[PDB]
Write an enzyme that holds these catalytic residues in place. Structure first.
Site, mmCIF file in Angstrom:
data_model
loop_
_atom_site.group_PDB
_atom_site.id
_atom_site.type_symbol
_atom_site.label_atom_id
_atom_site.label_comp_id
_atom_site.label_asym_id
_atom_site.label_seq_id
_atom_site.Cartn_x
_atom_site.Cartn_y
_atom_site.Cartn_z
ATOM 1 N N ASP A 61 0.778 -1.102 -0.401
ATOM 2 C CA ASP A 61 -0.102 -0.068 -0.124
ATOM 3 C C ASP A 61 0.991 1.418 -0.303
ATOM 4 O O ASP A 61 1.237 1.499 1.299
ATOM 5 C CB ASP A 61 -1.244 -0.109 1.042
ATOM 6 C CG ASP A 61 -1.719 1.355 1.451
ATOM 7 O OD1 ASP A 61 -2.483 1.983 2.586
ATOM 8 O OD2 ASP A 61 -2.398 2.259 0.451
ATOM 9 N N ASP A 67 -0.873 5.768 -5.396
ATOM 10 C CA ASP A 67 -1.601 4.761 -5.117
ATOM 11 C C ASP A 67 -1.977 2.785 -5.284
ATOM 12 O O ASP A 67 -2.895 3.044 -5.586
ATOM 13 C CB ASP A 67 -2.547 5.490 -3.613
ATOM 14 C CG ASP A 67 -3.248 4.426 -2.713
ATOM 15 O OD1 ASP A 67 -2.918 3.439 -2.222
ATOM 16 O OD2 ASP A 67 -4.201 5.081 -2.036
#
Ligand SMILES: CCCc1cscc1C[C@H](NC1=NC(C)(C)Cc2cc(Cl)ccc21)C(=O)O
Ligand SMILES: [Zn+2]
Ligand SMILES: [Zn+2]
Ligand SMILES: [Zn+2]
Length: 387
Positions: free
Chosen positions: A34, A216
Site C-alpha cells: 500500500d 497509490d
C-alpha cells in the site's frame, strides 16, 4: 533480482500482496502492498474472514510498545496495539529488521471475504503514519538497519513483482521516465496536462492536482477531482456515444455487457496523463488504455456476456493513480532521488490496435506551476517537528 520476480499475487479489485514473516519463530502472512499509507499493520486476533493472523504470544522477539492506535477511514476502521518485532520478506532481500507493527485487534469493513491478505504494508512516508510521524515506517527501518538501497519498484499484473532495493530491467521495455516526488508524505506528483483521445481537456492545470495527486497501489480506481472527473466522463461519453449506458454505469455502480468477445474497444478513448519532468518545462505522458479503466467482472447469470465496471471515480481529496493505472506500468519508487519512474511493463495490457505507453519529452514554453497549496490548518501549523 531473480529471487523477487513474481513475489506478488492479487488483483486491482482486492489488492496486491507480498509474503512477510513476523516474529520468531517466523509467522508467514500475506500482506497488502500500500503506497498510500505508512503503517505496517497486521490482523492480530480472530476475524471471520481470516484463518491466520499474527499471534504476538507465539513470538519470542515481540516487544509491546504499550500504546494503542486508532485508524479511521471514510469507509471503515482498524485499531490495535503498537509493538516491534523481527520482520523479513522471504521472497525479498536477504535481511531481517526490527520494525514497528500495529497488531490489529478490532476492525470494521477492512478485511474482506476472500482477499487473501491478513495485513497492510504502508510504504509511504512518516508524515502520514498513525498516530504521528514518530512511528518509523517499515521501509525507513529497512534502509536504516541494512543499507538495502532506498528504492523499490512495483510491476502489478492484471501476479506481479515488488523489487526491493533496485530496478530489474526484465520487468519493463523502453524508456524509464521520472517525475519528481513533490513532497515526501504520500507519493505526491504533479500532472501538467490531460488528454482524452488526443484532445486536451484544457483545464487550469492546478485543477488536475486539486488538492493533490498521488500514486497509490492501495486504491483500485483512477480517482479524479470532481471538475476533472466530469470533463472526462463527458469526453468518454462523447467517444462511446453509439452506446447509451445507464447513469449507474458512469457511477461505477453497474456493469455494462456485450456478447462474449464482441466488446467494441475502439469506441472507448485512451487517457494520457502528462507528469511533470525532472527538467523544468519538460513533461512525459503515460497513456492508459480503456482496458485499464473498464474492468471485467464475471457475474453469475451473464455467462454468455463480457461485463464491465467503470473504474474511474470522483474524488474530493485529489487525483489518485490507483492500481488499475499502475497495472500498465513498471513503477519505480526512487526515494533516494525523490522521484517516481514509469516504463511500459513487460506484463502488457493489450488492445487490438493501441498500446499503454510512456512517452516524452513534451516541452512547454512555460508552464505554470500546476501544484496546489493545501490551506494550512492551525492544527498542522502548531505541532513541532524536532528531528
Ligand atoms: C487495490 C486495493 C483495493 C482494496 C482492497 S480492500 C478495499 C479495497 C479498495 C480500496 N480501499 C481500501 N484500500 C486499503 C488500502 C485496504 C485501505 C482501506 C481501508 C478500509 Cl477501512 C476500507 C477500504 C480500503 C479503494 O478505495 O480503492
Ligand atoms: Zn514463499
Ligand atoms: Zn517543541
Ligand atoms: Zn514530526
Amino acid at each position: 533480482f531473480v529471487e523477487m520476480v513474481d513475489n506478488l499475487r492479487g488483483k486491482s479489485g482486492q489488492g496486491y500482496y507480498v509474503e512477510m514473516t513476523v516474529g520468531s519463530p517466523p509467522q508467514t502472512l500475506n500482506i497488502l502492498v500500500d503506497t498510500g499509507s505508512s503503517n505496517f499493520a497486521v490482523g492480530a486476533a480472530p476475524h471471520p474472514f481470516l484463518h491466520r493472523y499474527y499471534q504476538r504470544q507465539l513470538s519470542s522477539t515481540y516487544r509491546d510498545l504499550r500504546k494503542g492506535v486508532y485508524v479511521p477511514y471514510t469507509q471503515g476502521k482498524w485499531e490495535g496495539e503498537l509493538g516491534t518485532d523481527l520482520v523479513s520478506i522471504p521472497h525479498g532481500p536477504n535481511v531481517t529488521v526490527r520494525a514497528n507493527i500495529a497488531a490489529i485487534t478490532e476492525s470494521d469493513k477492512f478485511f474482506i471475504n476472500g482477499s487473501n491478505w491478513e495485513g497492510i504494508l504502508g510504504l509511504a512516508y512518516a508524515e502520514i503514519a498513525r498516530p504521528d510521524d514518530s512511528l518509523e515506517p517499515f521501509f525507513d527501518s529497512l534502509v536504516k538497519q541494512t543499507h538495502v538501497p532506498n528504492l523499490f519498484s512495483l510491476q502489478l499484473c492484471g501476479g506481479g513483482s515488488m523489487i526491493i532495493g533496485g530496478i530489474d530491467h526484465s520487468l519493463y521495455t523502453g524508456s524509464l521516465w521520472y517525475t519528481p516526488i513533490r513532497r515526501e508524505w504520500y507519493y505526491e506528483v504533479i500532472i501538467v496536462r490531460v488528454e482524452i483521445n488526443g484532445q486536451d481537456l484544457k483545464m487550469d492545470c492546478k485543477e488536475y492536482n486539486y488538492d493533490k495527486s498521488i500514486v497509490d497501489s492501495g486504491t483500485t480506481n483512477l480517482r479524479l477531482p470532481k471538475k476533472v472527473f466530469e470533463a472526462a466522463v463527458k469526453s468518454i461519453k462523447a467517444a462511446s456515444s453509439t452506446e447509451k449506458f445507464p447513469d449507474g454505469f458512469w457511477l461505477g455502480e453497474q456493469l455494462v455487457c456485450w456478447q462474449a468477445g464482441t466488446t467494441p474497444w475502439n469506441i472507448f478513448p485512451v487517457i494520457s496523463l502528462y507528469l511533470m519532468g525532472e527538467v523544468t518545462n519538460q513533461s512525459f505522458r503515460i497513456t492508459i488504455l480503456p482496458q485499464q479503466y473498464l474492468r471485467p467482472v464475471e457475474d453469475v447469470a451473464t455467462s454468455q456476456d463480457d461485463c464491465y465496471k467503470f473504474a474511474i471515480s470522483q474524488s474530493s481529496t485529489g487525483t489518485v493513480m490507483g492500481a488499475v493505472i499502475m497495472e500498465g506500468f513498471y513503477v519505480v519508487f526512487d526515494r533516494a532521488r525523490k522521484r517516481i519512474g514509469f516504463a511500459v511493463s513487460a506484463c502488457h495490457v493489450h488492445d487490438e490496435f493501441r498500446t499503454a505507453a510512456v512517452e516524452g519529452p513534451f516541452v512547454t514554453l512555460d508552464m505554470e506551476d500546476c501544484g496546489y497549496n493545501i490551506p494550512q490548518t492551525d492544527e498542522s501549523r502548531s505541532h513541532h517537528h524536532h528531528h
